[PDB]
A paper describes a structure:
In the pre‐PS conformation, the dynein heads have moved ~ 8 nm and the γ MTBD ~ 13 nm proximally compared with the post‐PS conformation. In this pre‐PS conformation, the linker is in a 90°‐bent conformation, which is similar to the single‐particle cryo‐EM analysis of cytoplasmic and axonemal dyneins heads in the presence of ADP‐VO4 (Roberts et al, 2009; Schmidt et al, 2015), while the stalks are visible and point proximally toward the adjacent B‐tubule (green and yellow in Fig 4G–I, respectively). The γ stalk of the prestructure is in an extended conformation, attaching with its MTBD to the adjacent B‐tubule between PF 7 and 8. The stalk of the β‐dynein appears to be in a curved conformation, similar to the conformation it adapts in the Shulin–ODA complex (Mali et al, 2021). A weak density between the PF5‐6 on the adjacent B‐tubule suggests that the MTBD of the α HC binds to the B‐tubule with the α stalk in the usual extended conformation. In the pre‐PS conformation, the proximal region from helical bundle 4 for the γ tail and 5 for the β‐tail up to the dynein heads deviates from the post‐PS conformation. To fit to our cryo‐ET map, the γ and β‐tail should move together with the LC‐tower around 1 nm proximally and 1 nm closer to the A‐tubule. With the combination of rigid body fitting of the crystallographically solved cytoplasmic dynein in the pre‐PS and the recently solved dynein HC in the Shulin–ODA complex in which ATP binds, we were able to generate a real‐space‐refined model for the pre‐PS state, which agrees with our tomographic maps. Our finding shows that the pre‐PS conformation of the α and β‐HC in the Shulin–ODA complex and those from the ODA bound to the axonemes are almost the same. We have built a model of the pre‐PS state (at intermediate resolution) and show that the linker, head, and stalks of the Shulin–ODA HC represent the native pre‐PS ODA conformation.
Numbering used by the authors:
A (entry chain d): 235 to 258, 933 to 939, 961 to 1047, 1062 to 1099, 1114 to 1312
B (entry chain F): 6 to 103
C (entry chain H): 8 to 92
D (entry chain G): 58 to 152
E (entry chain I): 22 to 110
Write the structure that this text describes.
Amino acid sequence: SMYSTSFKRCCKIMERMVVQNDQEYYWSQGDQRKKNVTSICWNPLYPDLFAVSLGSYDFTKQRMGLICLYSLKNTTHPEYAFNCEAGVMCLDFHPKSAALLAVGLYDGTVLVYDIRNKHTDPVWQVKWNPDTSKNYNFYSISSDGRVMNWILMKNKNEEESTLIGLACGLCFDFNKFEPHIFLVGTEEGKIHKCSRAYSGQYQETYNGHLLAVYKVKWNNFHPRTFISASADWTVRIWDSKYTSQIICFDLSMMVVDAVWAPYSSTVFACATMDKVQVYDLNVDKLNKLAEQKIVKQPKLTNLSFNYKDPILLVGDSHGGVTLVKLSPNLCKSGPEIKQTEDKKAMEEFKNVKIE
Amino acid sequence: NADDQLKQLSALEGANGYVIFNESGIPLKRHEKSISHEKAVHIAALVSDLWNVSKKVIQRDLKTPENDIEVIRLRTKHSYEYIITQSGDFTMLAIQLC
Amino acid sequence: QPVIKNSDMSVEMQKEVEEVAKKAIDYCNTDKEIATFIKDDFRSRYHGTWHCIVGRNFGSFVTFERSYYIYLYVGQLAILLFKTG
Amino acid sequence: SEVEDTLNRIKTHKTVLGYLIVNSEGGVVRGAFKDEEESKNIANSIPLLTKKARSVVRDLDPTNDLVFLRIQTKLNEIMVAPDDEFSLIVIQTKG
Amino acid sequence: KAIINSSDMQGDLLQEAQDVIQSGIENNSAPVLNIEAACKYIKENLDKKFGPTWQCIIGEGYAYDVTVQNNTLLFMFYNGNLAVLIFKS
């Protein structure tokens, strides 16, 4: 008993025995010198916690698949990890709080792990549907398009529960206010919409610019505004209330990751080839508001902004991590906040102008 | 280096009681006695003796002699923070929020 | 800065009290060591039995030999020295 | 076993110069020091000051215990993890 | 609220010591009280009662080191936080 109590003491002992005085650069290279960053995400339960996923090309190293966890104040290397020879992608976390971890395996299967613990088609996207009464539903879009969904209280999780929806696109974005409705850009050059009641209830398509779209998001503000970006480097403001898109904006690198910034400004960002092109439509026109190449390592991979501080974190194609801070571009604080609904009305005016 | 900076220092949020005391153990100014005058006297005397012990150790067998205390800031988390900053004549202490 | 608050000795023995107290302060950081320094010093120079208490919040009532008692403040320490036996 | 794991991880932690695992007594179980007498004077007198420290942290009130004593100096870093039976001290570079 | 901490003497003198420290509290029971007057009273009472060379000491945080005759020493605590030592030499 004395050994175990000394162990419990020594645990937190080491924990804040690593944290020493610093100015606030965490450039993680745990193994991942031959890996490639596939995703970066943050945690709401722990606003100072971030989880990254990478894919490796060299098997002569530690293990296969990747899920790494670490906090902002913790040592540069990933503090906690999950060890196995299983390639793991499609990563998401428990919606209420970080208690369960869900992953969509490469062979169409799905796995779930207790965080408080030591098919001829892959899955493409994954999402939790938070039902506070109990466990929280799971939706996985496969690489053919078809959607699956289920949830089970026993997490050792059994995919016996299942439901299937006739889905054609790969990255399904869901309606923030009404989660049952979803949309997607298909390779056929359209953007389909539907919902959870029937997979065939509402099978028309959004035709803002009518291109093969491979990315969708939603303006994390008052309206029911979303965005869809195509292989043809085109970005598209799908206002849910419209069938014709608002601002058919247009820029190279729109195939790749897009995002709404965690600021009051409706800032947009695209990023490939160690280069980010950034839009602040709240202060200027649709031309790019900023652009930055990075010489740290080539071919920047996935990124992450947190609302708290502009310590923007990014990975590289070499598997490493890095971060920089440009605080002067934090916020403008007058035009972004309450004039943003007026700005969306102004975008609709720009549509009337297009006509 | 003036009462203006001192007032700013009092305005530093999170700090509860400041205690500046001459090495003789005399709390000249304060913001802890402003809540309880029997606190900073005990604290100043006890911590002056503690700093004497710290001098002994900063001069005992591993710390080369001729090396002085520079700052001994301590923190009892969830209780308070207590900075000690030695001077040639003074000792700046502060009881802040941890 | 010694501050005599109640002494019985002659002025020379008092001066010796404050000098030995200053030396004990120069040498020993712990009150017990200071008091033993003073007590042994006086018990050795004179003969008999001395007792020294060093504190900060302290009252007592003791018997003591005539002109063999001091209660004072050296710096900010309460020194109560006396001879009994 | 966890004492082994933590000693191992401290050794893995670069910038450490002299490791010092003691018990609650003045017994250095393992030490990455060039001379042992130096570590002896410390691993003996520092527990004395640690008894003084627990004394005063309780003199406040029995509300907290001395969980750590991690000091940083100009030259190095004296990490001290008070433990039930042990005490985990390491001399590191203050990075 | 007497809380005896270290006893050396006989239980009768125990009881009388408690009674005397109590009476001293009542002699000086007011925010203007000083522990010194109660100390005078304790020592002088135990002199005129059980003989001279008594010694009374009152406080809450301090460190004594004194010589005492056997079966003539007491130290104790109060819920009012009064640590009281008495001893004969």
